[PDB]
Ligand binder design. Structure first.
Ligand code: SF4
Ligand code: SF4
Ligand code: SF4
Ligand code: SF4
Ligand code: SF4
Ligand code: ZN
Lengths: 149, 158, 109, 125, 71, 99, 127, 73, 185, 376, 181
């Protein structure tokens, strides 16, 4: 029962996800990819027309590809609870519901960089690190920061 | 320095280059798995005996060393020792990827990152394995390279 | 010709090595007269995708471990016995000395 | 009749195969009498040695004893008997019998299936 | 510009950026498109669906072709 | 021939002595192998071998002693078969950062 | 070019093979492509005369005729020329590789490159 | 004794005296999976990488550049 | 398959040295102590109903986490009864394990290879010189802690007129790509 | 006295031209294949098996794929199994031809070399048409094969089989029955079955004595249990009987090739599950899940369950085995490569005892030592 | 050796049944019948046609799925076909491909550096089958032997010009093989 539920939910998540993983900056660090390869099925029954969303300009740090968004509202309530500035929101109703700001409002906060970190899909990505490198290439050293105290 | 002496020197150099091009006597250094493709090159289809290529087992009588296969730290001294016995008019053809820059074992202990580190190689033949067609192309390229040797002119103008 | 006196050339069922250009490889591989159609899945597993049943990689029973002690070892040793029919079978084979033309007359392959 | 060849190049046909086997099996029983009775090795050795001695005593022809035993190659049987003598001598030379007390053995059993096309040694018929 | 000069030094032939800017936008009647790369889907790129509500041309992000809604 | 592990410090010492004997007897062969007669000083070579053995005294495990002797005999066979004031800190500082 | 046969001997073999052949095509570089079916073995029923008898090279075959010559395709070079892409593309160039430093390919960091690029991945202060 | 195995292992003596960092690599911030945590690595602090003059590649001279992160788990 | 002589062995083999047994379709496994490995292989080779008289190979596996990092594995075959068996033990860097050259003469080169790759020395080997790596090799390449590219590299030194060995300075360092998925467990 | 020969290095102790003992030095082609395989993913490690025992390429791919499938438990389709058998037998024919003709050249017979190379060129053309390159074609993968057969390949292979029956008859007529060939081969480097079992011989070198044991019949790892071929054995193991066994194996390989061509089925070429086999180009360009799985299979690999196994196949040289130990990750933790040249080259010492130098080279040719697999 | 002697005597008795057989065997061993037969076969092949390929003018057969020279393609419009997905070196077993990239001027994802070692490439086609956009292809060209290792060290510009030069043949092979996929 649990396995079938996971497979069905993965299929529904992937039925409208764009086939743009190679250009997606979350290659090898995308929760959709890993969970699809771990719990989801190996095939796709969907061959009809997908949905498409125009990109949003959210500042010089967050590059947004809203076609990849799975509408998990993880960043909508992050800006509400942790960031403290309520600009991002889930607006719309149904299969096509967009996320962001109604007006052109660049998101501005000290913690605004964490929005791209919690996005499971490559919907929100670091603009300065747009297409510089993948994940497996980078070696990670655990250090501390000196900009603040 | 004149225009008739220059013509005579050019004719002599052309004759010498023709002889050295038509009488290449390479020696196989057949390690790993470019040597089988080399034997295919020496077979009936892409025959080497037509162009003058005949494999001399003795390095003292050979013209150019064709290193085909992987060069190992245990075998590189042997390769250098055998190369040093070859006569002064000499050439090297590095066949494959192992003998060029280490190939598929570049990041490996006891593997020389190409025969260029041991002996001065003249022509590289890319491939893994390079087709017998490509190896014969490399031998023809060696013929072309030794087709522009102005040894007599260089000796005259010293 | 001297080579038809004896040897393989004298055999009526002798095949030449060289293949003719008009009969060996008629169509070049990049220009084939008929378009291929290679299947990639069974017809059943097209609109009935269900991976938790055909997940052959992960659907395996867990490894079972049992720590047998001296008492268990002695119990098994006393319980067990050997009979003439419980011994391992022998994988026996032997030469036959059979002619080369015995299987299908040397033709069937 | 007489066996022209045993097929195995190392093995050589022996005329008195039945007598050699009888002597080897009798010596096997006499030597295995020294092994402790509780050990399963002694029980198995007595079992198969007595069975082989009985069949080779009942059947006279080497072809008959081979056919009834089902192992074939009385020369191979003689080699096996000699190796059994050597093994019995070794297990008398060193004493492996008896559990060492406070002893634990980890029996591991996994039923992970394998495809039908991997190389698995099929049981003989 | 800087990127093109960084990967290429010929500076005599036309860079792919100039060619892809020179190819005109493709006018389509519908609100969404299917971008495949060329006439043969199997020889192009993975299919990309592009939304055309914004007035400006929308880059395909694959074989970028700038599809524009008709009206 | 390889021998079982030494079960006693005395046995390890005897094996060390045997290895040192082997090195001393094989020293003159290295003379003709390498040909550094100008500044070899065979006595100095023996002193250096003794110094290596003496700097390898901190080891006390007989197994480690036997392994060291095995590797030393291997090295001996290889050599026989001819297979080759500004303080320390400031010099390294002027050389490179990684020191 | 028939006088080259005496000191070439390989062009002689080609001319001997062009007795009963049919000229299936010719390229813009002058290479004449011949085909000869019938009583001919498989491996020797298509070939080329490079029209450069002095210094003919194996790399002078253009990509349009390369497949047909190598028996990859039944399509002659004319059809591939018709199908040649537009808006981009370069003319065929032989494998010089030794005819000159100004001809051979050089890396961006090689000293022989007309423009050599530094590689440090950081910008100094540059007072 | 703490070091006999190293001194007899055949590693060159110059690499047997170097500071290393033993740490458990933390979970990646990009994704919430916890199957790559709980492992411990030896971090040979080998940062001596430069740019190859010919092709701009990342050269190195320390043998322990990647073994601690690749093989030693 | 063919788990006949494996069960027969466990029925007849002395229980003193059978540290653990594994019944698997990937290969029946025996794990014992290094003291009794020679006796165990002698019993199997000589017994009439477990005649594993051919030694397929000897392998080594490195486990840096365990106290005895090295695992010496012996793959054996019984052609008379047509089945493969596996017998393995655990050894560390310094301790010497018994050699089975006397039983299986083919074991000499595999034991030399194990010495070369890991450092597990054998007690009764007629000789134990290195077989695979370069003359004068210093390390044991197949150890996990051993770097992939090694410690030294060779080149031709013109003044010395010989091929010399120098510490590694290789360009284009090995790029380790961490592909591991956090959801694989 | 000791005589040295210098990638085959060999030192011989001689008394009266009689070889008292021979010691080979083999490491000259060591390349760290096992270390590199440990450092690389399974798919990236398949070319290493391509390179090992390079005369017989696809046999090593078959062994590696069988080991991976055993550790992975994935079903291979019947068409993939049949084409794998067909190309394994083509590989066996190639290796036997090369071994026989190099042995003949070492003896002194030079002419069959080029005829068998014409046959080998035809077979390498088959390889190049079905896959990328003539040699080291990474065609056999875990779960199936890389690509389907091009059309016309079966007809070309049938024509080759007929002409190759003629060629084998031809070569046997020239070599077998020659007085010089017999004097070179018979009673040279004889091995008893006990000696072969002790020294771990396999394949022709083990069936030469007459142990009457073959891997394709003892442990059928393919449709081999549906191909009713023949396995020749030698009455008295020596060079001549091993050569005759190789000829008979070439004939039986042709037989198996014809049977596979006749009864090849129509279906798929690789495992059905995309978690273990990459999806097609159209599927990955059309389907979201297929794109995900292609991306994950080409960055990461299939994570085999943590287990250790030894999978052996009947390579043309002999029993080629791979011992794979995993830890649940995408890379093999340990990969031991048992090649059937490592044991035979040990056997050289006792085989070429009391013989002469020409007998030593004849024994080397008969054993067919490829140094890549012995230096794995 | 007594067994060998008696086996030899038995065999000699077996093959000396009668004077006809012994005379036939002696004549066959004396008059070199097998040698004559081998000579006749050799003469037949001397007089038969040859299979030499005549290299520079006649070239050996190939296949569209041939792994020759690595090369980079372009879209029909003219833009680079290669997005910077970095699936080349993720799968390249020999690690012969090095790639670096950044966002272009118009926001497109393109590679600012892409080099392949032809002395490290094993010519295996893993990249050309791992390409999601069919950007990198192993072209049909194989006669590209160079006199210098630095020449054999390719980069993005050389790969792109190779693709532009061999675009038509690469396209034909790609069509024929995309049929087989
Ligand atoms: S986040 Fe989606 S678009 Fe990005 S690589 Fe993963 S499954 Fe693909
Ligand atoms: S965190 Fe990402 S996927 Fe979730 S709602 Fe925000 S943009 Fe969409
Ligand atoms: S370059 Fe390739 S084909 Fe040649 S020896 Fe190396 S691995 Fe073998
Ligand atoms: S063909 Fe193979 S070795 Fe060559 S660049 Fe592509 S993946 Fe690497
Ligand atoms: S796989 Fe294709 S798109 Fe990706 S980096 Fe390589 S050539 Fe470019
Ligand atoms: Zn597009």
């Amino acid at each position: 029962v649990a396995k079938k539920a996971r497979e069905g939910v993965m299929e529904f998540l992937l039925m409208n996800h764009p086939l743009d993983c190679p250009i997606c900056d979350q290659g090898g660090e995308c929760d959709l990819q890993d969970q699809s390869m771990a719990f989801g099925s190996d095939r796709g029954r969907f061959t009809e027309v997908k949905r498409s969303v125009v990109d949003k300009n959210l500042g010089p740090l967050v590059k947004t590809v809203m076609t990849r968004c799975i509408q998990c509202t993880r960043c909508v309530r992050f800006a509400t609870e942790v960031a403290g500035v309520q600009d991002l929101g889930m607006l719309g109703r149904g299969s096509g519901e967009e996320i962001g700001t109604y007006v052109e409002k660049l998101l501005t906060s000290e913690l605004s960089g964490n929005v791209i970190d919690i996005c499971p899909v490559g919907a929100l990505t670091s603009k300065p690190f747009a297409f510089k490198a993948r994940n497996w290439e980078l070696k990670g050293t655990e250090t501390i920061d000196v900009t603040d105290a | 320095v004149s225009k008739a002496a220059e013509f005579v020197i050019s004719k002599v150099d052309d004759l010498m280059n023709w002889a050295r091009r038509g009488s290449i006597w390479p020696m196989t250094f057949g390690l790993a798995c470019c040597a089988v493709e080399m034997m295919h090159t020496g077979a009936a289809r892409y025959d080497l005996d037509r162009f003058g290529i005949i494999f001399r087992p003795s390095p003292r009588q050979s013209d150019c060393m064709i290193v085909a296969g992987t060069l190992t730290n245990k075998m590189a001294p042997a390769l250098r020792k055998v190369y040093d016995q070859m006569p002064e008019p000499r050439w090297v053809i590095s066949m494959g990827s192992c003998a060029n820059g280490g190939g598929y074992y570049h990041y490996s202990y006891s593997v020389v990152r190409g025969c260029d580190r041991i002996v001065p190689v003249d022509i590289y033949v890319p491939g893994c394995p390079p087709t017998a067609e490509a190896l014969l192309y490399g031998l023809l390229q060696l013929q072309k390279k030794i087709n522009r040797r102005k040894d007599f002119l260089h000796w005259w103008t010293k | 010709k001297p080579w038809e006196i004896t040897g393989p050339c004298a055999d009526p069922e002798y095949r030449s090595a060289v293949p003719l250009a008009t009969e060996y490889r008629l169509q070049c591989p990049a220009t084939t007269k008929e378009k291929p159609c290679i299947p990639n899945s069974l017809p059943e597993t097209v609109y009935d995708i269900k991976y938790f049943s055909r997940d052959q990689r992960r659907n395996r029973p867990p490894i079972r471990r049992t720590v047998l002690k001296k008492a268990d070892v002695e119990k098994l040793a006393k319980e067990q016995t050997f009979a003439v029919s419980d011994f391992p079978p022998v994988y026996l084979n032997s030469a036959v000395e059979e002619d080369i033309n015995a299987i299908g007359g040397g033709y069937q392959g | 009749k007489v066996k022209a060849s045993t097929g195995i190049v190392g093995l050589e046909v022996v005329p008195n195969a039945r007598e050699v086997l009888i002597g080897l099996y009798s010596k096997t029983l006499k030597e295995i009498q020294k092994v402790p009775e509780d050990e399963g090795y002694r029980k198995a050795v007595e079992s198969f040695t007595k069975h082989r001695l009985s069949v080779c005593k009942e059947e006279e022809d080497w072809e008959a004893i081979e056919k009834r035993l089902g192992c074939g190659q009385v020369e191979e049987l003689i080699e096996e008997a000699q190796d059994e003598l050597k093994l019995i001598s070794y297990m008398i030379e060193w004493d492996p019998w008896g559990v060492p007390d406070d002893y634990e053995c980890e029996v591991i059993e996994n039923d992970a299936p394998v495809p039908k096309h991997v190389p698995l040694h099929r049981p003989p018929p | 510009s800087n990127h093109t000069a960084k990967w290429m030094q010929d500076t005599s032939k036309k860079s792919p950026m100039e060619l892809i800017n020179e190819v005109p936008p493709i006018k389509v009647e519908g609100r969404i498109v299917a971008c495949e790369g060329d006439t043969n889907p199997a020889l192009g790129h993975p299919i990309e669906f592009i939304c055309l509500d914004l007035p400006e041309p929308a880059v395909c992000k694959y074989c970028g072709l700038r599809y524009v809604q008709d009206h | 021939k390889v021998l079982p592990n030494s079960a006693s410090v005395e046995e390890a010492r005897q094996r060390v002595f045997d290895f040192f004997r082997a090195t001393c007897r094989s020293l003159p062969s290295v003379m003709e192998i390498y040909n550094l007669y100008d500044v070899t000083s065979v006595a100095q070579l023996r002193s250096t071998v003794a110094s290596e053995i003496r700097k390898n005294i901190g080891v006390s495990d007989p197994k480690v002693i036997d392994m060291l002797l095995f590797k030393g005999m291997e090295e001996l066979m290889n050599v026989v078969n001819h297979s080759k004031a500004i303080s320390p800190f400031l010099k390294n500082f002027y050389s490179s950062n990684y020191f | 070019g028939y006088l080259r046969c005496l000191p070439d001997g390989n062009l002689l073999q080609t001319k001997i093979h062009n007795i009963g052949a049919t000229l299936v095509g010719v390229d813009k570089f002058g290479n004449k492509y011949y085909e000869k079916l019938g009583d001919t073995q498989y491996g020797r029923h298509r070939w080329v005369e490079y029209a450069e008898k002095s210094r003919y090279n194996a790399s002078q075959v253009p990509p349009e005729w390369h497949g047909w010559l190598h028996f990859i395709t039944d399509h002659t070079g004319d059809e591939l020329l018709l199908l040649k892409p537009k808006r981009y593309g370069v003319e065929h160039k032989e494998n010089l590789s030794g005819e000159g430093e100004q001809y051979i390919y050089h890396s961006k960091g090689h000293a022989l490159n007309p423009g050599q690029r530094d590689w440090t991945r950081y910008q100094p202060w540059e007072s | 004794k703490p070091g006999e195995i190293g001194m007899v292992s055949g590693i060159p003596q110059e690499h047997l005296r170097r500071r290393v960092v033993i740490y458990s690599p933390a979970r990646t911030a990009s994704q919430q999976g916890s199957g790559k945590v709980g492992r411990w690595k030896i971090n040979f602090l080998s940062t001596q990488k430069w740019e190859n003059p010919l092709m701009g590649w990342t050269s190195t001279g320390d043998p322990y550049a990647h073994v601690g992160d690749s093989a030693l788990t | 398959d063919n788990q006949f002589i494996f069960k027969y062995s466990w029925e007849t083999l002395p229980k003193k040295w059978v540290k653990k047994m594994e019944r698997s379709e990937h290969g029946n496994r025996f794990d014992t102590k290094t003291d009794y490995l020679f006796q165990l292989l002698c019993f199997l080779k000589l017994h009439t109903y477990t005649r594993v008289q051919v030694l397929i190979d000897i392998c080594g596996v490195d486990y840096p986490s365990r106290k005895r990092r090295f695992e010496v594995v012996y793959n054996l075959l019984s052609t008379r009864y047509n089945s493969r068996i596996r017998v393995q033990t655990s050894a560390d860097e310094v301790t010497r394990i018994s050699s089975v050259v006397s039983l299986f003469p083919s074991a000499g080169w595999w034991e030399r290879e194990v010495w070369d790759m890991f450092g597990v020395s054998f007690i009764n080997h007629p000789d134990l010189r290195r077989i695979l790596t370069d003359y004068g090799f210093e390390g044991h390449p197949l150890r996990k802690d051993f770097p992939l590219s090694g410690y030294v590299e060779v080149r031709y030194d013109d003044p010395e007129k010989r091929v010399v060995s120098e510490p590694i300075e290789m360009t284009q360092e090995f790029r380790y790509f961490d592909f591991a998925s956090p959801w694989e467990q | 006295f000791t005589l040295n020969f210098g990638s085959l290095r060999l030192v011989l102790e001689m008394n009266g031209e009689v070889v008292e003992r021979a010691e080979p030095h083999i490491g000259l082609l060591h390349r760290g294949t096992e270390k590199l395989i440990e450092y690389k993913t399974y798919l990236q490690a398949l070319p290493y098996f391509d390179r090992l025992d390079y005369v017989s390429t696809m046999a090593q791919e078959h062994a590696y794929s069988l080991a991976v499938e055993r550790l992975l438990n994935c079903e291979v389709p019947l068409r993939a199994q049949y084409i794998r058998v067909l190309f394994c037998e083509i590989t066996r024919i190639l290796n036997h031809l090369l071994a026989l003709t190099t042995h003949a050249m070492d003896v002194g017979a030079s002419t069959p070399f080029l005829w068998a190379f014409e046959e080998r060129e035809k077979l390498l053309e088959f390889y190049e048409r079905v896959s990328g390159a003539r040699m080291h074609a990474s065609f056999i993968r875990p779960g199936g094969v890389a690509q389907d057969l091009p059309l016309g390949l079966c007809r070309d292979i049938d024509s080759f089989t007929q002409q190759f029956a003629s060629r084998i008859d031809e070569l046997e007529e020239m070599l077998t029955g020659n007085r010089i060939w017999k004097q070179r081969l018979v009673d040279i480097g004889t091995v008893t079955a006990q000696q072969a079992k002790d020294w771990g011989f396999s394949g022709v070198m083990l069936r030469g004595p007459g142990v009457c044991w073959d891997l394709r019949r003892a442990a059928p790892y393919d449709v081999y249990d549906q191909l009713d071929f023949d396995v020749p054995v030698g009455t008295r193991g020596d060079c001549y009987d091993r050569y005759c066994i190789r000829i008979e194996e070439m004939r039986q390989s042709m037989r198996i090739i014809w049977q596979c061509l006749n009864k090849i089925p129509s279906g798929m070429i690789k495992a059905d599950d995309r978690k273990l086999c990459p999806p097609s180009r159209c599927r990955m360009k059309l389907s979201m899940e297929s794109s995900i799985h292609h991306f994950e299979l080409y960055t990461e690999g299939f994570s085999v369950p943590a287990s250790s196994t030894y999978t052996a196949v009947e390579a043309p040289k002999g029993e080629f085995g791979v011992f794979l130990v995993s830890n649940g990750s995408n890379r093999p933790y340990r990969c031991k490569i048992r090649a059937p040249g490592f044991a035979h080259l040990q056997g050289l010492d006792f085989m070429s005892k009391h013989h002469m130098l020409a007998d030593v080279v004849t024994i080397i040719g008969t054993q067919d030592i490829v140094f890549g697999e012995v230096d794995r | 050796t007594k067994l060998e002697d008696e086996q030899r005597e038995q065999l000699a008795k077996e093959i000396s049944k009668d004077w006809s057989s012994v005379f036939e065997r002696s004549i066959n061993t004396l008059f070199l019948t097998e040698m004559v037969r081998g000579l006749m076969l050799t003469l037949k092949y001397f007089f038969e046609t040859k299979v030499t390929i005549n290299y520079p003018f006649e070239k050996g057969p190939l296949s569209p799925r041939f792994r020759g020279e690595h090369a980079l393609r372009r879209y029909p419009t003219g833009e680079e076909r290669c997005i910077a997905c970095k699936l080349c070196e993720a799968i390249c077993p020999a690690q012969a491909i090095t790639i670096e990239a950044e966002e272009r001027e118009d926001g497109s994802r393109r590679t600012t550096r892409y080099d392949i070692d032809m002395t490290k490439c094993i010519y295996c086609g893993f990249c050309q089958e791992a390409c999601p956009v069919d950007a990198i292809v192993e072209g049909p060209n194989f006669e590209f032997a160079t006199e210098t290792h630095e020449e054999l060290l390719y980069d993005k510009e050389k790969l792109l010009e190779n693709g532009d030069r061999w675009e038509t043949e690469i396209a034909e092979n790609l069509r024929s093989e995309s049929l087989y996929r």
